[PDB]
Write a protein that binds this ligand. Structure first.
Ligand SMILES: [K+]
Ligand SMILES: [K+]
Ligand SMILES: [K+]
Ligand SMILES: [K+]
Ligand SMILES: [K+]
Ligand SMILES: [K+]
Ligand SMILES: [K+]
Ligand SMILES: [K+]
Ligand SMILES: [K+]
Ligand SMILES: [K+]
Ligand SMILES: [K+]
Ligand SMILES: [K+]
Ligand SMILES: [K+]
Ligand SMILES: [Mg+2]
Ligand SMILES: [Mg+2]
Ligand SMILES: [Mg+2]
Ligand SMILES: [Mg+2]
Ligand SMILES: [Mg+2]
Ligand SMILES: [Mg+2]
Ligand SMILES: [Mg+2]
Lengths: 117, 233, 245, 55
RNA sequence: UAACGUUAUUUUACUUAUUCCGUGAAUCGGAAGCGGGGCACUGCCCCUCUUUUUGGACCCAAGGCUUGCUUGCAGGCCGA
RNA sequence: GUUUAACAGCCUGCCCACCCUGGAAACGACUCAGUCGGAGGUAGGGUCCAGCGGCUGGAAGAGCACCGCACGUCGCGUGGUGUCCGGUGCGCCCCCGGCGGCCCUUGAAAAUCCGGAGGACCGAGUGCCGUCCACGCCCGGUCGUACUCAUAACCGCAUCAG
RNA sequence: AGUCGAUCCUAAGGGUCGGGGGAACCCCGACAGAUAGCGCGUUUCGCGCGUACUCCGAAAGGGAAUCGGGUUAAAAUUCCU
């Protein structure tokens, strides 16, 4: 054997991927954050109604754990409407609120009428 | 053809950068390597009492090869052979009315059994590994063999003894009897081993070992001695 | 009944050295085959000021003996060295100011600086501004060179120890009077929290053996035992004499 | 602001050896020094060979 | 003042215990070769490891010999 | 009160720095102060650097001011005119440039980005290999964001002259 | 809120592996040591480099990117154009 480096380096040895005999968890967990759990209920305040009328935007109360991507996906699944952009904030009461602006192809007033506000 | 030319490199202090060289002797080795080398160095440096020093003189190469090729034909049966013999015996028990079988002749192993055979004077030849760790297990075995008048030899490799007896390692092996066709050669090896080890036990009892310094200090001492001799002549 | 200032020094945490703006330790190259047998050439690229150090430092760039890269070093500058100068370090280096040579190759009566104590330690003696060591004699039998240090002491070191030819630059710094407390404040701000100093006789007894009394005075001999325990060992420690010469 | 996606190549490149790193005078000095030092090395080697032949 | 023996204080030798220093543990010990000097005659002993007018560059081998087979190229020795 | 944002293009080119011609005492040039010049000054001609500089697009369609018509309870309605031309400075706030004074004081690091030395290796003939060029296409998470900041929203037991 | 900040970087320092102490709670802190890994081509294997912390530490240090105009009872360089 010929060594050109004075420093000794640990040789590379094979590693094996885990192949457990039994699964630690019997079955995959349930999807807690589904679309129904993501979308709690729409907001029916005066400001929300003004947003719907003017900016073609819906106002929703959403699970605090939900992100903008999940909110967009849940809105699409629930109401079959595209979203131009989702803005989010956490109210002082601790709940998450989302302003979801629909694309021009969709009418916020018609969507709200279908929802039932 | 004329476009090829030599580009010699001038290697030296301040010259062209040297090519890759052998740096093995300068390697910063791991702790295990360093300690196992320093242990050998320390054992060489320190004086070895005669009882331990007697284990440095092993059987010669030719004698060891002859002894071990003799031993290879007395190996104990392996697991497969044992199972095959047991199943044959079970099958033939009732049918053959338990026919008599000749007593097997095989090498004996296991420190307990070897010591018992030596004490009972049943052993005819004892083979002791030179690298037993801890060595207190076999340091007294040469003395016991000498007292019991049992020829003993010290050979290289507990791993080789273990390979003889189908084990990873074996502290020692023993032969209690040999076959008729092998008695003469066994007697030859026995006389050789007795002349090599048993007859030299008394002289080796007083011979200390070790005390060997490093090569560099040896060279320094030789240079000093040469200077002294040149001055004295 | 209270720990004195000298005692509190050892724990540190307010008496640690101020080293935030320092440029790293100043030392010779690691001793290698080139310096042991032949010589190696570097170039002085910069002369810099090291805060808290009177002597200027010199940045020197060397060519690595066996790697394709630059070897960067920081030497204690010797008086007379300049940017762009060639420095030669090794046993065969010429006897010129700024070169680093083994003491075995330095003739007697030579002035050197940053002298090694142990072969390869990279320099521990005569490093302050304006200081130098003098080569006295050589002993080939045991391979030892004798040197005179700045304090005047004579020391025997192995002849393989290296040293830079010449004296340390920046000499004469201490001649200038400071004239005011602000200059000392600035000086020690980059060194350590050792200034100003309060006299022991100005303290109360609880925090100094010299403290107390209706008059300011020590009240007992200021010379103390070499084996006096910490907290009691103040004043002139193990003084063989006192007063004027 | 020097990032390639933000600044044009001509604005951050100088068309010369060591362009953008060394000044023109520095590059000229380096070229002259290299040439003259190599010439002096050749001269020294030739002188050494001639001296060896003479002795 | 020595043959025998006891005692105490010093000087000195070895390196592996121990302690310390340096390094990215990068040429350590011996010998032999390439070159330079003298001797008298074919051998001896004495030395060197290649870099000092310049604020440059310097790595990952050219070359030779030898194998697979006829080279996409690949494997060895010297170079070292 | 009489306004012009980010951003894109073109122009310009402070004080410096740099380049070409040329070779200077009767020395010259030059700043408030300095300073510079055969190691190449003055002079002539150029390059580059800053800009919170100029023009254009943005952008007059916007904002502002003025003058009108109309619903007169709910048209966030409807229309026109102008937004122009100069001066001044040891002025005040901010940014920048270039000198000079001071130190026994010389006044951070890293992420990140740009550039360079070398050239192993790499492609075809009507298509191949590259391309930091122009245009086109898609996406961009999580948390904070109200309000006071004090002779009552902080601390001082308070809506406290601190 | 892709464009304002945190988030990223490191400062004084803090917290640690191994090692060394310690009855032990714990103490020192990269100092007693086979480091993390990083590039090239790929039958995913080979080749080449690889100095023992790729951790915390700044809403005033360093640092990718937004501007007008308009809008609310209360938000905006975040909402509208
Ligand atoms: K106390
Ligand atoms: K102080
Ligand atoms: K005082
Ligand atoms: K007193
Ligand atoms: K007094
Ligand atoms: K901007
Ligand atoms: K390149
Ligand atoms: K806000
Ligand atoms: K505040
Ligand atoms: K421990
Ligand atoms: K540690
Ligand atoms: K920050
Ligand atoms: K806007
Ligand atoms: Mg290592
Ligand atoms: Mg007094
Ligand atoms: Mg208008
Ligand atoms: Mg290139
Ligand atoms: Mg309270
Ligand atoms: Mg531990
Ligand atoms: Mg990090």
């Amino acid at each position: 054997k010929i060594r050109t480096k004075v420093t000794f380096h640990r040789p590379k040895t094979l590693k094996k991927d885990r192949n457990p005999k039994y699964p630690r968890i019997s079955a995959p967990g349930r999807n807690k954050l589904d679309q129904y759990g993501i979308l709690k209920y729409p907001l029916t305040t005066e400001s929300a109604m003004k947003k719907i009328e003017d900016n073609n935007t819906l106002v929703f109360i959403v699970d605090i754990k939900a992100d903008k991507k999940k909110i967009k996906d849940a809105v699409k699944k629930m109401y079959d409407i595209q979203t131009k952009k989702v803005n989010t904030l956490i109210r002082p009461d601790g709940t998450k609120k989302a302003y979801v602006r629909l694309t021009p192809d969709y009418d916020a007033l018609d969507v709200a009428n279908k929802i039932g506000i | 053809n004329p476009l090829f030319e030599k580009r010699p490199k001038q290697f030296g202090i301040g010259g062209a950068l040297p090519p890759k060289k052998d740096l093995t002797r300068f390697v910063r080795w791991p702790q295990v390597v360093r300690i196992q080398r320093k242990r050998r160095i320390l054992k060489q440096r320190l004086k070895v009492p005669p009882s331990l020093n007697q284990f440095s003189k092993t059987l010669d190469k030719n004698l060891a090869t002859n002894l071990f090729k003799m031993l290879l034909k007395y190996r104990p049966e392996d697991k497969a052979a044992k199972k095959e013999r047991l199943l044959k015996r079970a099958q033939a028990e009732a049918e053959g009315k338990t026919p008599e079988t000749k007593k097997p002749i095989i090498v004996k192993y296991g420190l307990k059994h070897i010591t018992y055979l030596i004490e009972q004077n049943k052993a005819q030849l004892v083979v002791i590994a030179h690298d037993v760790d801890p060595i207190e297990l076999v340091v007294w075995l040469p003395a016991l063999c000498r007292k019991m008048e049992i020829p003993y030899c010290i050979v290289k490799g507990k791993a080789r003894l273990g390979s003889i007896v189908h084990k990873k390692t074996a502290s020692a092996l023993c032969l209690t009897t040999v076959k008729n066709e092998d008695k003469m050669e066994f007697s030859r090896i026995l006389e050789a081993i007795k002349a090599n080890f048993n007859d030299k036990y008394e002289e080796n009892r007083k011979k200390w070992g070790g005390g060997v310094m490093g090569s560099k200090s040896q060279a320094r001492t030789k240079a000093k001695e040469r200077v002294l001799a040149k001055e004295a002549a | 009944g209270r720990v004195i200032r000298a005692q509190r020094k050892g724990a540190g945490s307010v008496f640690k050295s101020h080293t935030h703006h320092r440029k790293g330790p100043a030392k010779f190259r690691s001793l290698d085959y080139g310096e042991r047998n032949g010589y190696l050439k570097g170039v002085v690229s910069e002369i810099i000021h090291d805060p808290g150090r009177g002597a200027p430092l010199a940045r020197v760039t060397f060519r690595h003996p066996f790697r394709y890269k630059h070897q960067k070093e920081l030497f204690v500058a010797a008086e007379g060295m300049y940017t762009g100068q060639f420095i030669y370090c090794g046993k065969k280096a010429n006897l010129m100011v700024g070169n680093v040579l083994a003491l075995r190759s330095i003739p007697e009566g030579a002035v050197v600086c940053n002298v090694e104590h142990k072969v390869g330690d990279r320099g521990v003696f005569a490093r302050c501004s304006g200081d130098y060591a003098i080569v006295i004699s050589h002993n080939p039998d045991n391979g030892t060179t004798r040197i005179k240090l700045p304090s005047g002491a004579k020391k025997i070191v192995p002849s393989g120890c290296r040293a830079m030819i010449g004296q340390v630059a920046g000499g004469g710094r201490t001649e200038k009077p400071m004239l005011k407390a602000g200059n000392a404040y600035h000086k020690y701000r980059v060194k350590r929290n050792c200034w100003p100093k309060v006299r022991g006789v100005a303290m109360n007894p609880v925090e100094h053996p010299h403290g107390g009394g209706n008059h300011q005075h020590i009240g007992h001999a200021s010379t103390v035992r070499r084996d006096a325990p910490p907290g009691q060992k103040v004043g002139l420690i193990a003084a063989r004499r006192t007063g004027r010469l | 602001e020097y990032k390639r996606s933000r600044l044009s190549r001509n604005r951050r490149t100088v068309n010369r050896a060591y362009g953008g790193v060394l000044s023109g005078s520095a590059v000229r000095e380096r070229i002259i020094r290299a040439f003259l030092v190599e010439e002096q090395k050749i001269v020294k080697k030739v002188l050494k060979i001639q001296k060896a032949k003479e002795k």
